[PDB]
Amino acid sequence: KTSSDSISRMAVPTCLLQMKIQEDPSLCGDKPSISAVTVELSKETLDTMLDGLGRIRDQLSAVASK
Amino acid sequence: GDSAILLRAIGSQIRDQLALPWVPPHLRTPKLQHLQGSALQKPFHASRLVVPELSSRGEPREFQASPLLLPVPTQVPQPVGRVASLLEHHALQLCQQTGRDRPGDEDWVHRTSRLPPQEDTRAQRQRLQKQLTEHLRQSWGLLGAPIQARDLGELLQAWGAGAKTGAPKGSRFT
Amino acid sequence: EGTPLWRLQKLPAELGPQLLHKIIDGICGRAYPVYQDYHTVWESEEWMHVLEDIAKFFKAIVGKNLPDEEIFQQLNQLNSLHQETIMKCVKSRKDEIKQALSREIVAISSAQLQDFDWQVKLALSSDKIAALRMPLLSLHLDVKENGEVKPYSIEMSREELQNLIQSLEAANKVVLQLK
Amino acid sequence: MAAGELEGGKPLSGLLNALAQDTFHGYPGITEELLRSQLYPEVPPEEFRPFLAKMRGILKSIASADMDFNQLEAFLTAQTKKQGGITSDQAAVISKFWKSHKTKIRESLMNQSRWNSGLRGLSWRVDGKSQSRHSAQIHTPVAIIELELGKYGQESEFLCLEFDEVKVNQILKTLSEVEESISTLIS
Amino acid sequence: LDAKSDVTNQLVDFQWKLGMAVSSDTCRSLKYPYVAVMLKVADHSGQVKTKCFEMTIPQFQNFYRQFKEIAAVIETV
Amino acid sequence: MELSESVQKGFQMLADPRSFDSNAFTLLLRAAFQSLLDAQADEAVLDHPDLKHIDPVVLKHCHAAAATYILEAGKHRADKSTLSTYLEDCKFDRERIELFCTEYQNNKNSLEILLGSIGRSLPHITDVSWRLEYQIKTNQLHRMYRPAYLVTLSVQNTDSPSYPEISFSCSMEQLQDLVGKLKDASKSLERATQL
Amino acid sequence: MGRLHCTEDPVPEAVGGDMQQLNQLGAQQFSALTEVLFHFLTEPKEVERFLAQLSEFATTNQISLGSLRSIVKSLLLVPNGALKKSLTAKQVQADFITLGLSEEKATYFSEKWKQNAPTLARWAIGQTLMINQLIDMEWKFGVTSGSSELEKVGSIFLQLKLVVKKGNQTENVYIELTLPQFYSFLHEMERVRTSMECFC
C-alpha cells in the first residue's frame, strides 16, 4: 500500500488470498454454484493464522509419534 | 339502451358459458382452452419498425426499394409482435400528427393558419434554453472551485523512488 | 492493426450489403444475421469480434457526426468496392442509428419501461353488496430493471385515473414546450 | 372566530416550522400538531381546518422559484390583502424565515426527487504489486477505488474496481471530454 | 481458471450523459444540472453487470481531481 | 377509429386504376392478410411477378396502410357499413369495395381470435383434490379425535408456463364457510344470468 | 510573493478573518478545550458529553456555540492536513513560526499534538481501502468413522470458518479441507510470511 486518499505515502505489506469453492448442486438448486472469494489480510492476522495451524500440525505430529 | 342492452348481452353470454360443463384440461379443444383457461395467452410487446417514406430525395430511396428493406408487417417473426408493433406505430404517428396539421377547434386551429415550420416557436423557447444554459454556466466556479492545486501532481516526478527491497528474506515459524 | 473493419476484407464485394444492413437492423431492435449464412468466410470466435467491431464503429461514426472526408479516409485501405458500400450504408439509414442511440441514452437509469397493456372491466357484484356496478381499469407494466423484466399491475377507478391523467398532463405541458 | 391570527404569533410560526419539518425534511415522527391543540385551547369549534389549507397553499406557493425577496413582498401582499391576511410585520417575519431555511428546503426537495443511485462518497487506494503464488517478481502498480452508492432512504451498496496505467489514462481522457462538453455548452 | 490480475472486478466499458432536471411535481422550477454514469463490469465468472448512478457538478469535479491525483501517484512509483 | 395522414395517402393511391388493377389490388390485399395472419411468412408475400411493374416504395407504403386499416377495423369491431362508407370517401368503386368486404369476411374469425389473445391475467384455477383424515394425537397432546380436511388447488400462471399447486388445511366449519361463499358466488352469477 | 505553505485548501479572508478569535479566550480554557478535543476524538460513541460540558459554558457566559464550533473547525485544519500528508515536525513548526498565531498558544498546541501524533497517525491506517478484511477465524480438526455407504473409514478432515467483513455487513465462509490440501495451505502461508517481510 504505497499511498491512499487519507495519507500521501507509506510502504506497508498486505496479502490477498483468493480461493475456489465447490458446493453440492443439490444444496443450491439447479446451479453448479462454484464461487470465488478474496480476503485481504495483515501481519497480525497472518501470524495468528500461522500459529494456530502450526499448533494443529504439532498436535498431529505428536499423535503420530505417540 | 346500452345501459340495459349491455346487461342483456352479458346475461346471454353468462348463460351460454354456463351451458358448457367443465372438462379436464387434458381433453380440452382450443375453444374450451380459451373459455376454461388462459394457457394460450401471449403478452404485448412492440419492436422498433421502419417504413418506406414517399420522399424521393435520393440515395436512401435505393435502400427503400431494395429487398434489404423487408415489407413492414413481416419485419418480426411472430404475428403478435407484428400486430403490436403496427398498432404502436400507428398510435405514435397519430400522436405526432396531433402536434402537427390538425383541423381542430375555433381557437386551436388559429395558430395553424400562419405557423412556420418549427421556426416561429424557437423565439419563445430560446428563452427557456437561455435559463438552462445560464444555470449550467453557474456552479463552474460558484462553489468549491477554483480547484487549481497544481502542486500535488507533478512534483512527485522529480523526486522519484528512493528506497527498494533487497534479497529474499525469511525466518523460522514461531 | 488499422481500422477495426480490416477483418471485413475476407468477405467478397457481393455479400457486403446484406451483412451490413442486417447488422444495422439488429442494432435498431430487429434480429441479427445468423452464422449459417456466412460461416465459410469466418470463424465463430472471430465472427463475434467482427460483428462487435462493425456495430461499435457505426455507432461511433453516427454519434460523433463526422464529415464526409474523415469517414472516407479511415476506409482507405479496404476493398476497392467495400468503401462505397459502407459510405452509402451510412448515408441511407443514419437516422435509424441516431434513434437507437437516443433510445439507449434512456438506458442510463435504474429501470426503463418496455411496453404495457390495459384492460377495462365492469364490476357487477361482490360479497359485500350485489349492486356494485364499479368500472375498474387494470394497468399492466413490464419494466426492465438491472437485467431482468419485472411485470407490475395496478387497479384504478375513475377518480385515481383522473388524478393520474391530470398529473401526466401537467408533465406534458412541460415536455411539449421543452422540444 | 378571530383568535390567534391577529393575537398570537407563536402558534402560527410554530405551525409553519412544524409543516416545514413534516413536508420537506422528512421527520413526521412527532410534530406539534398533537400538542398545540391541548396546550393552546383556542381551537375554533367549527372552522379550524380550512385555515391550515391556506397555510399549505402559501407554503407551496413560495416553493416554486424562490424569487428575490423584493418580489416576494408583492405576491404576499396580493394574496394576503384579503380577510385574515398576514400583517406587514408578519409578512416581513415570514419572508425572513424563508432565508432561515432556503438551502435546506432546496436540498431536501432535490434529495426527495432522486430516481437513481447517487454518489455518497469516494474512497480509493493505489498500491504496488510484488509477487504471487507462481510469479516471483512484479512491479506494475494498480489502483483500488470503492464507490458508496445508494438510493435515498435505502441501505448503501459498495462497488470495488481494479485498474492499471492504460485504463486510468482512458478514464481520465473520458472525464476530460466530459469537462470539455460542460465548458462548451455555456455559450 | 485462476489468474492473479483479476481479483474482484474489472470494468469493461464506461458511458456517461449530461442533462439537467427541468420540473417536478413538487417544484416547477427545479432546474439544476447533473451528470450521470453507466458502468458495466465483469467478475471472475465472466459475466457482465450494469451499475448506473447519478452525480452533481461538485461531486464530478472531486471525482476528476481524485483520479488525477491517483494518476500522478501511480506514475511516480 | 382515427387514422393518420400517411394511411389516407396510401388509400388514396390504392384507388387509381393506373397504379393498380383488379388483380393487383386483390393480390396486395391477400398478401397483407397473409402477412398479418401467417406465422411463417417471408418476403415471398411480394414475390408475385404480377406486381413487378410498380415502384416498391408505393407498394410497401400501401401494404402497410392496408394492414393498419385491417388492424384498426378488427380492433374496433367494424362492420360492413363503416368500411363501405370510409372506402367510398376514398374514391373507390363498387368492385373494389365489394372485394375488400369479401376479403374481410373470409378470414374475420381468425383476426378476431388473434387480437383477443394478447394480455395477461390472474392465475386461473382448474380443479381441486381433497383428503379426509382423522387427527388422533401430537407429541404434546394424546387424545383429540377430530376430523380435518386437506385441500390442494391446481392453478396455472399465464406468466410462467407451469402448474404450481396451492395447498391448505381446513376443518369442517371452515370447509362449510368456504362452500357457502362459493355457493353465494354461484347464486350471484345466476342472478346476473336471469336479468 | 509565491504560494503559502500553511494552507493546501485555499482559505480566503472570508474564512481566515476568524482565525484571530482564539486570542480572546484564556489559557486554562485553551488547555481544557484541547484535551477535550482529543477525548472527544477518542470516544465518539458518547456525544452527550459534548452538550453536557457546553451547558456550563452556555449558562455561565452565554457564549454562542456557533463561534466556538467555527473556531474549532478552523483550528483542526492544520493537523488534519498533517495527518493526510504526514508532515515533519520542522514543517509544522516553521509554518506556525512564519504565520505566528499567538505563538504562546501554538508552541503548546504543537508540542501536545506531536506527543499524541503517532496514535492518531496509526488510527488512520485502519480507515482506508481494505477489500473484504478478515476479522476472526475458527477451525475444527476431526476424524470420520463411517458414512451412509461405507461402514468403516478413517478419512481425516478440517473445517474452517472465516469472519470476512463484506462491507458494512459481515459474512461467514465455511470450508472443508483434506489432509494434503491442509498441508499445502500451511506451506503456502509459510511462503507468504517469508515474502511479506522482505521489504520491512
Curated annotation (Swiss-Prot), chain C:
Residues 112-179 form the COMM domain. Its main location: cytoplasm. GO terms for molecular function: NF-kappaB binding. One of its GO terms (biological process) is signal transduction. Widely expressed with highest expression in thyroid. It is found in: Cytoplasm; Nucleus. Keywords: Cytoplasm, Nucleus, Transcription, Transcription regulation. Pfam families: COMM_domain (PF07258), COMMD8_HN (PF22838). InterPro entries: COMM, COMMD4/6/7/8, COMMD8, COMMD8_HN. GO terms for cellular component: cytosol; nucleoplasm. Belongs to the COMM domain-containing protein 8 family. Scaffold protein in the commander complex that is essential for endosomal recycling of transmembrane cargos; the commander complex is composed of the CCC subcomplex and the retriever subcomplex. May modulate activity of cullin-RING E3 ubiquitin ligase (CRL) complexes. May down-regulate activation of NF-kappa-B. Component of the commander complex consisting of the CCC subcomplex and the retriever subcomplex. Component of the CCC (COMMD/CCDC22/CCDC93) subcomplex consisting of COMMD1, COMMD2, COMMD3, COMMD4, COMMD5, COMMD6, COMMD7, COMMD8, COMMD9, COMMD10, CCDC22 and CCDC93; within the complex forms a heterodimer with COMMD4. Interacts with RELA, RELB, NFKB1/p105. Interacts with CCDC22, CCDC93, SCNN1B, CUL1, CUL2, CUL3, CUL4A, CUL4B, CUL5. This is COMM domain-containing protein 8. It comes from Homo sapiens. The gene is COMMD8.
From Swiss-Prot, chain D:
The modification N-acetylalanine is found at residue 2. Residues 125-187 are annotated as: Required for binding to PtdIns(4,5)P2. Ubiquitous. Highest expression in the liver, with lower expression in brain, lung, placenta, pancreas, small intestine, heart, skeletal muscle, kidney and placenta. Down-regulated in cancer tissues. Acetylated by EP300 ina stimuli-specific manner; protecting it from XIAP-mediated proteasomal degradation and required for interaction with RElA in response to stress. CDD domains: Commd1_MURR1. Keywords: Acetylation, Copper, Cytoplasm, Cytoplasmic vesicle, Endosome, Lipid-binding, Membrane, Metal-binding, Nucleus, Protein transport, Transcription, Transcription regulation, Transport, Ubl conjugation, Ubl conjugation pathway. It is found in: Nucleus; Cytoplasm; Endosome membrane; Cytoplasmic vesicle. Changing residue 134 to A: Reduces copper-induced fluorescence change. InterPro entries: COMM (IPR017920), COMMD1_N (IPR033776), Murr1 (IPR037351). It comes from the Eukaryota. GO terms for cellular component: Cul2-RING ubiquitin ligase complex; cytoplasm; cytosol; early endosome; endosome; endosome membrane; nucleoplasm; nucleus. Residues 2-123 are annotated as: Sufficient for interaction with SLC12A2. PROSITE patterns: COMM. This is COMM domain-containing protein 1. It comes from Homo sapiens. The gene is COMMD1.
Curated annotation (Swiss-Prot), chain E:
It is found in: Nucleus; Cytoplasm. Ubiquitous. Expressed in brain, heart, skeletal muscle, lung, pancreas, liver, kidney, small intestine and placenta. GO terms for molecular function: NF-kappaB binding. The keyword 4Fe-4S does not apply. The keyword Nucleotide-binding does not apply. Residues 10-77 form the COMM domain. Keywords: Acetylation, Cytoplasm, Nucleus, Transcription, Transcription regulation, Ubl conjugation pathway. GO terms for biological process: negative regulation of NF-kappaB transcription factor activity; signal transduction. PROSITE patterns: COMM. Its main location: nucleus. GO terms for cellular component: cytoplasm; nucleus. It comes from the Eukaryota. Belongs to the COMM domain-containing protein 6 family. Component of the commander complex consisting of the CCC subcomplex and the retriever subcomplex. Component of the CCC (COMMD/CCDC22/CCDC93) subcomplex consisting of COMMD1, COMMD2, COMMD3, COMMD4, COMMD5, COMMD6, COMMD7, COMMD8, COMMD9, COMMD10, CCDC22 and CCDC93; within the complex forms a heterodimer with COMMD1. May form a homodimer with isoform 1. Interacts with RELA, RELB, NFKB1/p105. Does not interact with NFKBIB. Interacts with CCDC22, CCDC93, SCNN1B, CUL4A. This is COMM domain-containing protein 6.
Swiss-Prot record, chain G:
It is found in: Cytoplasmic vesicle. Residues 133-200 form the COMM domain. GO terms for biological process: negative regulation of DNA-templated transcription; negative regulation of NF-kappaB transcription factor activity; tumor necrosis factor-mediated signaling pathway. The keyword Transcription applies. It comes from the Eukaryota. One of its GO terms (molecular function) is NF-kappaB binding. Keywords: Cytoplasmic vesicle, Transcription, Transcription regulation, Ubl conjugation pathway. Widely expressed with highest expression in lung. One of its GO terms (cellular component) is cytoplasmic vesicle. Component of the commander complex consisting of the CCC subcomplex and the retriever subcomplex. Component of the CCC (COMMD/CCDC22/CCDC93) subcomplex consisting of COMMD1, COMMD2, COMMD3, COMMD4, COMMD5, COMMD6, COMMD7, COMMD8, COMMD9, COMMD10, CCDC22 and CCDC93; within the complex forms a heterodimer with COMMD9. Interacts with RELA. Interacts with CCDC22, CCDC93, SCNN1B, CUL7. Scaffold protein in the commander complex that is essential for endosomal recycling of transmembrane cargos; the commander complex is composed of the CCC subcomplex and the retriever subcomplex. May modulate activity of cullin-RING E3 ubiquitin ligase (CRL) complexes. Associates with the NF-kappa-B complex and suppresses its transcriptional activity. Belongs to the COMM domain-containing protein 7 family. This is COMM domain-containing protein 7. The lineage of its organism: Eukaryota, Metazoa, Chordata, Craniata, Vertebrata.
